Structure 1
Amino acid sequence: LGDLYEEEMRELRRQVDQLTNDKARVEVERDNLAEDIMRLREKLQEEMLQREEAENTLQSFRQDVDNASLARLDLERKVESLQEEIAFLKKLHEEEIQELQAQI
């Protein structure tokens, strides 16, 4: 009867209400994750700039470390060189004077 219409409409008004509360529920979830995603992308755009700057500094600083290391080697050698010269002087001085006990 007129009953089928009321029953087919009881059914529909029910679905529309389910779906309406669900579309509501899911909209809230999305609105939420959309905030998180914004907070995050920023915190990350941030870290990127720090990480990058950090690596850049470390790039031209490797040069400085190399150069300081070599400057210290260039001296460790200048010194060793002076020592071989002094070690020779003495071999020579010492000799250059035995050659005057002959010819006293």
Structure 2
Amino acid sequence: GSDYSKYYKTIDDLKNQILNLTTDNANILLQIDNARLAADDFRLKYENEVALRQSVEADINGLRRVLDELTLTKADLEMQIESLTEELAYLKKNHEEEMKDLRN
């Protein structure tokens, strides 16, 4: 019958609509899955980054403390060297003068 033919048309339209919807939704699910893996991958890479940066920065702070210590030490040594240099020169010239005196 004709009416039955119309109903048939609607049936097939719904069948194909199913097929299309299942395929589309499957593709979207794959997009979601791959995007998941990408987010997780980026979080691992990031974690590695914060680890490397952690070691670097800590080492930096340690090296700041060291540098300050070394500069203070340098200044101190310069002072001491100055004093001992004056003292040595005095010693040498004084002994030589005493030699001159006793020889005269």
Q: Please say whether Structure 1 and Structure 2 have the same fold, judged by a TM-score greater than 0.5.
A: yes
In the TM superposition, structure 1's runs of 4+ consecutive aligned residues that sit over 3 Å from their partners are 83-91
Deviation at 1:46, TM superposition (A): 1.8
Return the match for 1:45 from 44, 47, 51.
Answer: 47
Cα root mean square deviation, aligned: 2.7
Partner of 1:30: 32
Give the TM-score normalised by structure 2: 0.73
Specify every segment of 5 or more residues in structure 1 that has no aligned partner in the other structure, as ranges.
none
Q: Which string of whole-angstrom CA distances, capped at 9 and with x for unpartnered residues, describes residues 25-80 of structure 1?
A: 11112222222222221122122122112211211220111101211121112112
Give the TM-score normalised by structure 1: 0.73
Q: How many pairs are equivalent?
A: 100
SS at match of 1:40: helix
Specify every segment of 5 or more residues in structure 2 that has no aligned partner in the other structure, as ranges.
none
Tell me the percent identity.
31
Partner of 2:84: 82
Structure with bigger helix share is 2
